[PDB]
Amino acid sequence: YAQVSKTHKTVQRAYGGSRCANCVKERIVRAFLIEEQKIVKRVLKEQQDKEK
Amino acid sequence: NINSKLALTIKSGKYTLGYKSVVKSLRTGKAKLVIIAANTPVLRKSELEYYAMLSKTPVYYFQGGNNELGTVCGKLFRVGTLSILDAGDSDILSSI
Amino acid sequence: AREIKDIKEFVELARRSDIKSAIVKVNAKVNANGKKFKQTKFKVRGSRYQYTLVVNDASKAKKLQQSLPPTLKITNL
Amino acid sequence: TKRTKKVGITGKFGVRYGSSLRRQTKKLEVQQHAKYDCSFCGKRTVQRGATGIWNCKSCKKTVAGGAYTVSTAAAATVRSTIRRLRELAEA
Amino acid sequence: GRVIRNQRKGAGSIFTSHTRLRKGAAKLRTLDYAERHGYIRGVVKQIIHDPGRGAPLAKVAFRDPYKYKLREETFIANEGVYTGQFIYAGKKASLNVGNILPLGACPEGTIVSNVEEKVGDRGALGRTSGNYVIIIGHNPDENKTRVKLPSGAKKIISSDARGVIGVVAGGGRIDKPLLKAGRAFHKYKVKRNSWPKTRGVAMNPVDHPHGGGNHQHIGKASTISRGAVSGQKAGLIAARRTGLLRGTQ
RNA sequence: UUUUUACUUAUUCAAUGAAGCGGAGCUGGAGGUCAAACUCCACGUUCUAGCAUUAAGCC
RNA sequence: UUGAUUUUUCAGGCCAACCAUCGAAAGGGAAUCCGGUUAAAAUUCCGGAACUUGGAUAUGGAUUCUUCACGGCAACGUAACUGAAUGUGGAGACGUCGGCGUGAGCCCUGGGAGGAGUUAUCUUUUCUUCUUAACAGCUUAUCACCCUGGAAUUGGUUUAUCCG
RNA sequence: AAUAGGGUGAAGCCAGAGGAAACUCUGGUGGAGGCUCGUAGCGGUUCUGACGUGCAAAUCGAUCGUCGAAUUUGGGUAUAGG
Ligand SMILES: [Zn+2]
């Protein structure tokens, strides 16, 4: 692998030569959805920090 | 009771079975209700209800697994999720 | 050994500064769908590789041979 | 046709080891070679690896189980016992 | 006479454990600030077979609280633990199968495994397949907890000692007969050199206290004093009773 | 002199790449407040096999 | 590890879990083949043709005025096409048996071009030569994956019944 | 690192037949087993054979045990005289 060009050892994508396409797709969706719910759990917490 | 309501919709109304069909029906705005089986992966589940939030669609959480959700629909296969396009003779949309 | 297909690339390659010598090989072949024809292989010896151009046309070979640099040593086989 | 009247999977042992030991082997060895329903994907694709290891071919979920069954009766009791005691503590 | 097989094991030449294929020592995490004050979350990456062990092991990845690094722990897999499960360890961890909690944080009747004898020894009790520890009661004034061990013994442990909720996976292993000498050979091929065993009564008087005679027989009582010396302790050492166990004990 | 149990520094056991110990104080949740705020608890992480590293900001 | 300094001084920036060493001519492991040659050496010599590692280094190409390239819905493609500390992974790297499939070498065999044998008779006959290395380019695959689509009258499918 | 060629035919699977059900029967397929016949191999039963100042300080011949595992084996390594 040291003596071959980079296109042979990677794929033009995030985590190209490290993760497969489906595992990168699942990381992206999981990162987006989980972080979206983090905002929801924060605004909801602030809703219970002013009435209860 | 909802099993009886859901069975009537399959007999008389319109529906799609399967994750790929449900997401298409949420994109097109043709979904009236989304039913998700209990053993559906949470990542797929939390994504279906994000699509429904954008699409302004109610979500019903079936209590059984995809084996039980499939047999309620009169199918001999497993149904992880489904969308109701047209509740016909049933009143499932008014109950959920 | 690398094979060269473009005749224009071969003449530009034969005038590289590291090119020691050239070989002109004549093969009496037959296409089996006709009769005898004379194939010519032009072989250029560079530092790393020997470069071969196969010229199946007996006339394009003669024109190509006089198109090589006059300084190259040419061995006729 | 039916090939063996009663030995079943233990017919590989021939006449050796004693009938009582072979019928005791048959009970647990049918269980360890069975296919179980996956609690994650719903398919009947769960098979044993080594003891206590049960893999699903479809969804590639591995669960820790019993030596010869995916779940022992003792584990099922603990699951409900832990579930019950959790409810009281969390009200 | 000669040095008997009991005594040759302590030198440990051919009697050490065969440990090439073992997958690491099964331990809890080192007790740190997160477990003492809150909880830390890890994810189950693998559930693997450990040669020489009936219980499968779980590989759980935690974050290092102080440096950018992943820490892989080797836990004893409780039954029901699956790959991709989140494992919570600490004082504030919830009562779920696979979570690591201090003993005082568990109500009476909680089934727990890989329990610490002492705070921070990373697990001593109930580690084999199908085994567990039952929490009997608490003594909050003295900060002590009563537990029942797999042998039936009652023990008093610090309430800060940790354990893993559930039963050790792989239980029921003993229910199946081995049926063959070869099965025991393969069983001990990855444990240690203790099989097969020659009966001492079948040896010569040099080899064993039971050897010799014109019939195979022990000749003297096989119950041996606790105060006997090495080379004598062959048989039933400090036996309170002998014979078939009849009735309750 | 004998029995018991208090101390920790001798001694002994264990762990860690000696990372958050002990006390007090900030903040809330409470006791019913009979001076005046004393006592107790907590004090940023729990649908998901994602991410977290080489400080932003304020003075 | 850098920026250096020519001030042969330095300035610092990161880290020091673990890490003396020995232990395999059958384990792991950078890289070579063919033809010829001696009385006796050859993957070592000769001829030709390659390869790896370390170092130095210029030219061409590539890239930049939207500074660190484009194309494809996608799987992904390419002659290239910044990337420190630190981190995460992969390869190294792995039992045994059973049948199945593909390849290679060998075995068998037809025509043709040669050479040898038998031939009282018979035998378009019996035997034999007809080869192609490492390496370079293009092309080539089970499996796996992507897009489309939405399936009971269930269908696809292996020698071995698994898949939706 | 090594271990011809056969026999038998366990689970699982396919099809057909019978039954109200609980279930049963048949034909294939499949290829299990410290299974079996039997080479190499490993061993060493009997002739109480040969030899017995030997080919040999343990061999030779026939016969025999076993032959896919508790198998056979090279090298490295550990254990040392009460
Ligand atoms: Zn599954």
Curated annotation (Swiss-Prot), chain A:
Q: Name one GO biological process term.
A: ribosome biogenesis
GO CC annotations on file: cytosolic large ribosomal subunit
Q: Per the record's keyword annotation, is Cytoplasm included, yes or no?
A: yes
**Main location (coarse class):** cytoplasm
**Gene Ontology MF: a single term:** structural constituent of ribosome
UniProt keywords (A-Z) are:
Cytoplasm, Ribonucleoprotein, Ribosomal protein
SS bond list: none
- Origin superkingdom: Eukaryota
Question: Where is the protein found, in the record's own terms?
Answer: Cytoplasm
Keyword Ribosomal protein appears in the UniProt entry: yes
Task: Give the family from UniProt.
Answer: Belongs to the eukaryotic ribosomal protein eL34 family.
Quaternary structure (record): Component of the large ribosomal subunit. Mature ribosomes consist of a small (40S) and a large (60S) subunit. The 40S subunit contains about 32 different proteins and 1 molecule of RNA (18S). The 60S subunit contains 45 different proteins and 3 molecules of RNA (25S, 5.8S and 5S).
What is this protein's function? Component of the ribosome, a large ribonucleoprotein complex responsible for the synthesis of proteins in the cell. The small ribosomal subunit (SSU) binds messenger RNAs (mRNAs) and translates the encoded message by selecting cognate aminoacyl-transfer RNA (tRNA) molecules. The large subunit (LSU) contains the ribosomal catalytic site termed the peptidyl transferase center (PTC), which catalyzes the formation of peptide bonds, thereby polymerizing the amino acids delivered by tRNAs into a polypeptide chain.
The name of this protein is Large ribosomal subunit protein eL34
* Organism the protein comes from: Candida albicans (strain SC5314 / ATCC MYA-2876) (Yeast)
Q: Which gene is transcribed and translated to give this protein? A: RPL34B
Swiss-Prot record, chain B:
Q: Where in the cell is it found?
A: Cytoplasm
**Alphabetically ordered keywords of this record:** Cytoplasm, Ribonucleoprotein, Ribosomal protein
Q: For this UniProt entry, what is the primary localization, expressed as one broad class? A: cytoplasm
One GO term under biological process is: rRNA processing
**What molecular function does GO assign, one term?**
RNA binding
Q: Which GO terms describe its cellular component?
A: cytosolic large ribosomal subunit
| Signal sequence interval, chain numbering | none
- Supply the InterPro entries for this chain: Ribosomal_eL30-like, Ribosomal_eL30-like_sf, Ribosomal_eL30_CS, Ribosomal_eL8/eL30/eS12/Gad45
Which domain of life does the protein's organism represent?
A: Eukaryota
Tell me which family the UniProt entry assigns to this protein: Belongs to the eukaryotic ribosomal protein eL30 family.
PANTHER family (alphabetical)? RIBOSOMAL PROTEIN L30 (PTHR11449)
Q: How does it assemble?
A: Component of the large ribosomal subunit. Mature ribosomes consist of a small (40S) and a large (60S) subunit. The 40S subunit contains about 32 different proteins and 1 molecule of RNA (18S). The 60S subunit contains 45 different proteins and 3 molecules of RNA (25S, 5.8S and 5S).
The record describes the protein's role as: Component of the ribosome, a large ribonucleoprotein complex responsible for the synthesis of proteins in the cell. The small ribosomal subunit (SSU) binds messenger RNAs (mRNAs) and translates the encoded message by selecting cognate aminoacyl-transfer RNA (tRNA) molecules. The large subunit (LSU) contains the ribosomal catalytic site termed the peptidyl transferase center (PTC), which catalyzes the formation of peptide bonds, thereby polymerizing the amino acids delivered by tRNAs into a polypeptide chain.
Protein name, UniProt field: Large ribosomal subunit protein eL30
Gene that this sequence comes from: RPL30
Curated annotation (Swiss-Prot), chain C:
Protein task: Component of the ribosome, a large ribonucleoprotein complex responsible for the synthesis of proteins in the cell. The small ribosomal subunit (SSU) binds messenger RNAs (mRNAs) and translates the encoded message by selecting cognate aminoacyl-transfer RNA (tRNA) molecules. The large subunit (LSU) contains the ribosomal catalytic site termed the peptidyl transferase center (PTC), which catalyzes the formation of peptide bonds, thereby polymerizing the amino acids delivered by tRNAs into a polypeptide chain.
UniProt-annotated location(s): Cytoplasm
Biological process, per Gene Ontology: protein-RNA complex assembly; translation
Stored Gene3D superfamilies: 3.30.720.90
What InterPro entries would the database entry show? Ribosomal_eL38 (IPR002675), Ribosomal_eL38_sf (IPR038464)
Q: Which UniProt keywords apply?
A: Cytoplasm, Ribonucleoprotein, Ribosomal protein
Checking PANTHER family in the record gives: 60S RIBOSOMAL PROTEIN L38 (PTHR10965), LARGE RIBOSOMAL SUBUNIT PROTEIN EL38 (PTHR10965:SF0)
Oligomeric state and interaction partners are given as: Component of the large ribosomal subunit. Mature ribosomes consist of a small (40S) and a large (60S) subunit. The 40S subunit contains about 32 different proteins and 1 molecule of RNA (18S). The 60S subunit contains 45 different proteins and 3 molecules of RNA (25S, 5.8S and 5S).
**What is the official name of this protein in its record?**
Large ribosomal subunit protein eL38
- Cellular compartments per GO CC: cytosolic large ribosomal subunit; hyphal cell wall; yeast-form cell wall
- In the record, what terms sit under GO molecular function? structural constituent of ribosome
The family database entries (Pfam families) matched by this protein are listed as: Ribosomal_L38e (PF01781)
UniProtKB/Swiss-Prot annotation, chain E:
The source's superkingdom equals Eukaryota
Q: What is its main location?
A: cytoplasm
GO BP, one example? Answer: cytoplasmic translation
Q: Where in the cell is it found?
A: Cytoplasm
- Which GO CC terms are listed, alphabetically? cytosolic large ribosomal subunit
SUPFAM superfamilies in the cross-refs: Nucleic acid-binding proteins, Translation proteins SH3-like domain
Instruction: List each coiled-coil range.
Output: none
Give the protein family.
Belongs to the universal ribosomal protein uL2 family.
Q: What does this protein do?
A: Component of the ribosome, a large ribonucleoprotein complex responsible for the synthesis of proteins in the cell. The small ribosomal subunit (SSU) binds messenger RNAs (mRNAs) and translates the encoded message by selecting cognate aminoacyl-transfer RNA (tRNA) molecules. The large subunit (LSU) contains the ribosomal catalytic site termed the peptidyl transferase center (PTC), which catalyzes the formation of peptide bonds, thereby polymerizing the amino acids delivered by tRNAs into a polypeptide chain.
**Record note on quaternary structure:** Component of the large ribosomal subunit. Mature ribosomes consist of a small (40S) and a large (60S) subunit. The 40S subunit contains about 32 different proteins and 1 molecule of RNA (18S). The 60S subunit contains 45 different proteins and 3 molecules of RNA (25S, 5.8S and 5S).
The protein here is known as Large ribosomal subunit protein uL2
Specify the species. Answer: Candida albicans (strain SC5314 / ATCC MYA-2876) (Yeast)
Gene from which the chain derives: RPL2
